[PDB]
Amino acid sequence: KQFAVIGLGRFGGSICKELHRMGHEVLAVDINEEKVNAYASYATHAVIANATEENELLSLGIRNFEYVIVAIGANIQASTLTTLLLKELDIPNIWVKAQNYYHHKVLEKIGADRIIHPEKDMGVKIAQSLSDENVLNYIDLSDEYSIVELLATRKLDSKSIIDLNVRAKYGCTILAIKHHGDICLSPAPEDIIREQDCLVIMGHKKDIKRFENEG
Amino acid sequence: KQFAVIGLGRFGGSICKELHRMGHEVLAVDINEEKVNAYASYATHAVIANATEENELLSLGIRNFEYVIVAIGANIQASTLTTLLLKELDIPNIWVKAQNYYHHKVLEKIGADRIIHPEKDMGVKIAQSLSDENVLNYIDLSDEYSIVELLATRKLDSKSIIDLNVRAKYGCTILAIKHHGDICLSPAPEDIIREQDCLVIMGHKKDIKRFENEG
Amino acid sequence: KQFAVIGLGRFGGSICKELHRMGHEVLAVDINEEKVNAYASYATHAVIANATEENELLSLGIRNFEYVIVAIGANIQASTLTTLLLKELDIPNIWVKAQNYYHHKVLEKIGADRIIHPEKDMGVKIAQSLSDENVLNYIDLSDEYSIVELLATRKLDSKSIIDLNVRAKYGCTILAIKHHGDICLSPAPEDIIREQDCLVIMGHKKDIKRFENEG
Amino acid sequence: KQFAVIGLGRFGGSICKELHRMGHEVLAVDINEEKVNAYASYATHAVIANATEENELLSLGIRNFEYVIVAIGANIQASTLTTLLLKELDIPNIWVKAQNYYHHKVLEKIGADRIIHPEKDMGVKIAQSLSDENVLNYIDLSDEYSIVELLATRKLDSKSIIDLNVRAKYGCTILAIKHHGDICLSPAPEDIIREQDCLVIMGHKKDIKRFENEG
Ligand SMILES: Nc1ncnc2c1ncn2[C@@H]1O[C@H](COP(=O)(O)OP(=O)(O)OP(=O)(O)O)[C@@H](O)[C@H]1O
Ligand SMILES: Nc1ncnc2c1ncn2[C@@H]1O[C@H](COP(=O)(O)OP(=O)(O)OP(=O)(O)O)[C@@H](O)[C@H]1O
Ligand SMILES: Nc1ncnc2c1ncn2[C@@H]1O[C@H](COP(=O)(O)OP(=O)(O)OP(=O)(O)O)[C@@H](O)[C@H]1O
Ligand SMILES: Nc1ncnc2c1ncn2[C@@H]1O[C@H](COP(=O)(O)OP(=O)(O)OP(=O)(O)O)[C@@H](O)[C@H]1O
Numbered sequence: 001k002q003f004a005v006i007g008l009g010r011f012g013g014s015i016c017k018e019l020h021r022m023g024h025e026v027l028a029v030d031i032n033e034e035k036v037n038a039y040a041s042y043a044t045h046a047v048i049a050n051a052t053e054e055n056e057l058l059s060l061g062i063r064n065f066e067y068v069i070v071a072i073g074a075n076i077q078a079s080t081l082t083t084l085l086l087k088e089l090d091i092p093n094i095w096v097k098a099q100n101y102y103h104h105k106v107l108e109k110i111g112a113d114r115i116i117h118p119e120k121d122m123g124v125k126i127a128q129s130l131s132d133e134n135v136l137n138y139i140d141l142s143d144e145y146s147i148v149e150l151l152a153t154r155k156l157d158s159k160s161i162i163d164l165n166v167r168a169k170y171g172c173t174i175l176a177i178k179h180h181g182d183i184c185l186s187p188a189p190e191d192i193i194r195e196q197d198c199l200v201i202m203g204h205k206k207d208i209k210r211f212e213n214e215g
Numbered sequence: 216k217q218f219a220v221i222g223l224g225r226f227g228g229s230i231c232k233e234l235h236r237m238g239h240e241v242l243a244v245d246i247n248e249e250k251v252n253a254y255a256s257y258a259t260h261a262v263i264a265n266a267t268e269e270n271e272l273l274s275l276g277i278r279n280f281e282y283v284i285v286a287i288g289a290n291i292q293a294s295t296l297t298t299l300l301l302k303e304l305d306i307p308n309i310w311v312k313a314q315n316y317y318h319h320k321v322l323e324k325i326g327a328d329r330i331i332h333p334e335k336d337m338g339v340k341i342a343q344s345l346s347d348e349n350v351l352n353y354i355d356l357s358d359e360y361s362i363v364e365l366l367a368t369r370k371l372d373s374k375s376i377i378d379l380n381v382r383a384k385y386g387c388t389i390l391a392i393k394h395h396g397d398i399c400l401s402p403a404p405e406d407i408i409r410e411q412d413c414l415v416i417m418g419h420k421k422d423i424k425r426f427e428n429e430g
Numbered sequence: 431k432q433f434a435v436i437g438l439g440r441f442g443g444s445i446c447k448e449l450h451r452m453g454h455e456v457l458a459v460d461i462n463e464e465k466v467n468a469y470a471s472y473a474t475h476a477v478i479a480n481a482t483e484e485n486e487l488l489s490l491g492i493r494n495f496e497y498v499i500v501a502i503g504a505n506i507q508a509s510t511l512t513t514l515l516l517k518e519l520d521i522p523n524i525w526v527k528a529q530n531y532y533h534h535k536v537l538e539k540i541g542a543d544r545i546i547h548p549e550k551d552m553g554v555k556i557a558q559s560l561s562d563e564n565v566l567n568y569i570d571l572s573d574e575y576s577i578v579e580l581l582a583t584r585k586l587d588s589k590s591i592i593d594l595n596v597r598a599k600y601g602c603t604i605l606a607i608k609h610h611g612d613i614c615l616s617p618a619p620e621d622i623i624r625e626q627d628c629l630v631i632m633g634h635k636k637d638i639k640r641f642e643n644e645g
Numbered sequence: 646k647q648f649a650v651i652g653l654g655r656f657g658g659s660i661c662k663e664l665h666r667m668g669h670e671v672l673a674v675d676i677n678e679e680k681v682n683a684y685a686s687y688a689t690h691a692v693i694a695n696a697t698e699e700n701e702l703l704s705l706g707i708r709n710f711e712y713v714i715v716a717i718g719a720n721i722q723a724s725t726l727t728t729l730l731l732k733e734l735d736i737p738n739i740w741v742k743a744q745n746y747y748h749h750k751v752l753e754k755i756g757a758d759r760i761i762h763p764e765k766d767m768g769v770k771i772a773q774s775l776s777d778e779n780v781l782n783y784i785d786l787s788d789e790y791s792i793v794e795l796l797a798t799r800k801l802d803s804k805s806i807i808d809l810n811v812r813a814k815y816g817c818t819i820l821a822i823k824h825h826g827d828i829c830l831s832p833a834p835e836d837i838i839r840e841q842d843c844l845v846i847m848g849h850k851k852d853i854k855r856f857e858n859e860g
């Protein structure tokens with residue numbers, strides 16, 4: 001797999017550094033000279049180029065990349081023109097970072113395979129942690145079911161798993177308990193719940209909220 | 216709970232809209248007139264103010280907010296001077312959006328309770344999906360254990376749960392299977408695995424990668 | 431018919447002045463204060479507004495206009511987001527002025543009913559007059575047939591229509607002859623051809639060029 | 646014929662590409678480095694130069710060109726100083742693209758052989774098509790007579806030429822009928838008029854409008 005990342009910002013530069021860490025061939029393209037010099041050591045190849053130009057895009061050998069990530073999310077004109085060129089060049093996978101709702105609609109029309117909202121998705125996840133401080137990290141399996149990594153309270157100290165009627169009353173299944181950097185995978189009844197550490201739970205979205213308030 | 220969000224960007228405006236959707240009192244503060252007019256309907260109170268000024272900050276009644284989120288991640292001077300004022304005003308919870316590694320170190324010194332990297336965290340999660348297309352969304356329970364929502368392949372079609380020796384060989388536990396918008400919570404042996412839909416699994420980080428390659 | 435012209439440039443301001451001359455209700459929208467003040471007397475209604483904003487676009491009553499002309503041809507971001515909003519608002523006819531080939535392709539994707547190249551079409555017509563000074567104005571009926579308003583040469587002076595074997599040899603039909611501000615519609619054989627005045631001809635594109643060189 | 650085009654914009658670059666297509670020697674002059682690199686392949690010779698400088702203008706051998714086209718229509722100072730130099734250098738034909746009415750008056754004073762308004766002429770032609778949707782393209786032979794390429798309506802279907810009394814009542818002559826990419830030159834009575842395709846007509850300006858309303 002050969003990856004090309006166009007636009008070395010906070011979001012684009014993180015993809016370059018992570019893919020280079022995993023041992024992947026990454027082409028880092030940016031119009032800024034200082035950005036390319038900073039990410040020259042964090043990419044297989046770093047080029048100072050304008051992606052809105054077809055002649056400069058063909059000089060990179062961009063047709064040899066299966067995945068191209070257009071991480072420009074503040075210039076709609078630069079973002080939409082780039083993916084119009086890549087779609088014309090028959091790139092199998094174009095992932096674009098969008099800015100707002102209207103930018104999302106343009107990229108969907110001109111054939112962007114996946115459209116990403118990094119700050120919008122994180123802001124929704126952060127606002128869930130602000131509203132309820134008991135949660136630490138959650139993953140939405142669907143619109144009604146989710147896996148929530150809860151934080152243990154003071155009332156849950158010295159409590160066994162069989163004491164908590166999550167399976168019967170709340171209809172939720174405890175998945176894993178982490179104690180002081182040691183994680184217990186699929187605990188069996190019964191285990192004593194320690195102080196304020198991680199507690200992974202799975203259930204309906206409304207059912208987990210009932211467990212937090214009651215227990 | 217009263218929340219104040221300072222800086223209505225892509226990240227800050229998403230927290231305002233999500234907290235207002237949940238029914239929370241949100242104060243939206245921005246130095247830009249156009250940003251405040253756009254988010255006036257998505258916040259309980261929207262004020263055009265400079266947060267680096269103590270006199271303007273005290274005019275907002277900012278001492279009445281338990282949570283203040285400083286969502287300025289491109290102006291380090293504006294971000295660090297705001298949280299210095301809020302720390303001086305004894306705000307119990309200050310959550311700051313950082314820009315790079317050096318901005319993270321300054322905010323840790325001047326007393327930021329939680330420091331957030333929205334684009335850096337999403338770029339790491341996106342790069343995991345680029346490297347392995349079988350994964351869809353994952354949550355890191357620890358540095359060695361994670362819950363990965365896999366995507367079913369063609370070889371897993373018409374296969375039962377008991378046929379897959381994930382519990383014995385791979386040491387991984389299947390958590391939930393979603394079929395065409397219908398999610399089965401904690402499936403029992405045995406269930407037929409359908410076509411390319413969601414498949415939630417839990418196990419060691421290295422053990423899940425073995426399951427993807429072999430099966 | 432109610433027309434809205436967005437962008438009062440050299441091209442947009444000409445549509446406003448011509449439609450207002452014919453007695454049509456024209457809404458002139460521009461983001462520049464000086465442009466609106468200049469065209470306030472040449473439009474039924476002139477508003478200073480940003481067309482990329484949906485709230486400002488709905489304040490104009492833009493849903494009441496059958497034809498909206500987006501005459502912005504130097505800002506691709508402003509041009510493509512305006513027509514995305516108008517397409518979302520179900521405007522029956524959206525005519526957009528494009529900048530280059532790539533801007534033409536974006537507007538075709540997001541549903542522009544007619545795309546106009548004013549300078550590109552005039553430059554092609556002007557370059558035809560530079561290459562052959564005998565022509566004055568031409569209209570392309572098809573890719574092989576055209577009506578060319580020729581200019582009479584010195585060798586065509588004191589020549590009758592029957593003397594010119596355009597119908598038999600060249601396969602071209604003389605349409606109209608203009609003499610000193612007096613235009614003769616469909617002349618009959620034979621009429622004396624005067625000095626260097628207009629001479630409208632119709633025929634194949636290659637056949638007219640043979641007539642110019644030989645006669 | 647040797648042509649020089651000064652200013653490679655939307656209008657100037659179209660003249661360069663069209664004249665180069667016809668097989669003419671074109672000198673493309675622009676002050677922008679990126680414009681010259683783009684049109685280097687579409688011109689015989691492309692030079693990065695400032696046309697307001699006499700020393701740079703004489704380095705191009707501009708005295709060897711019969712036609713010079715000054716396609717600068719947004720900088721009046723650059724446009725008027727260029728044609729003052731070319732008039733001083735005794736260029737036989739100087740064609741200048743103007744911006745407004747006052748720019749047209751200056752160029753007429755300092756000796757511009759032909760002054761062109763590309764957006765103003767297209768805006769007038771476009772506004773004629775907006776006012777009456779039956780017309781497609783027209784050419785003004787004079788102030789009272791024109792050739793209009795009409796669009797066939799539903800009431801003109803299955804109608805013969807002799808049925809339409811354009812020659813007797815309206816005083817208009819049908820010139821050519823185009824059917825599905827096939828163009829009939831000077832049709833003879835009688836031909837059946839098909840569905841909504843091109844229909845070229847010639848007559849007085851007021852007489853054609855009567856034909857559209859009645860038929
Ligand atoms: N036409 C272009 N071609 C290549 N790179 C470009 C182009 N235009 C902008 N860039 C670069 O893309 C990077 C990211 O774009 P920008 O800063 O506008 O977006 P952003 O949404 O604010 O970024 P992020 O949130 O990832 O920090 C910048 O380093 C910028 O220099
Ligand atoms: N001193 C300040 N007080 C209040 N708001 C401010 C101040 N300085 C900047 N802002 C606002 O904060 C918002 C977000 O800041 P900025 O755009 O610099 O950061 P960012 O990291 O690029 O944002 P995001 O990624 O969330 O789009 C902007 O709307 C900006 O106007
Ligand atoms: N978002 C916008 N909303 C409304 N008007 C706008 C907007 N952006 C630009 N305009 C106006 O549109 C007009 C024409 O746009 P612009 O000058 O960028 O294009 P152009 O192709 O150079 O124009 P022209 O060739 O017709 O002179 C200008 O008067 C400009 O102020
Ligand atoms: N002094 C100069 N000498 C040569 N070229 C020039 C000079 N000044 C401007 N130009 C170039 O002339 C070109 C056209 O000029 P400009 O863009 O100002 O006019 P315009 O009327 O907006 O153009 P168009 O409608 O053809 O796009 C531009 O590429 C510009 O760089």
Ligand code: NA
Nearest residue numbers: 010119225334
């Ligand atoms: Na950002």
Ligand code: NA
Nearest residue numbers: 440549655764
């Ligand atoms: Na123009």
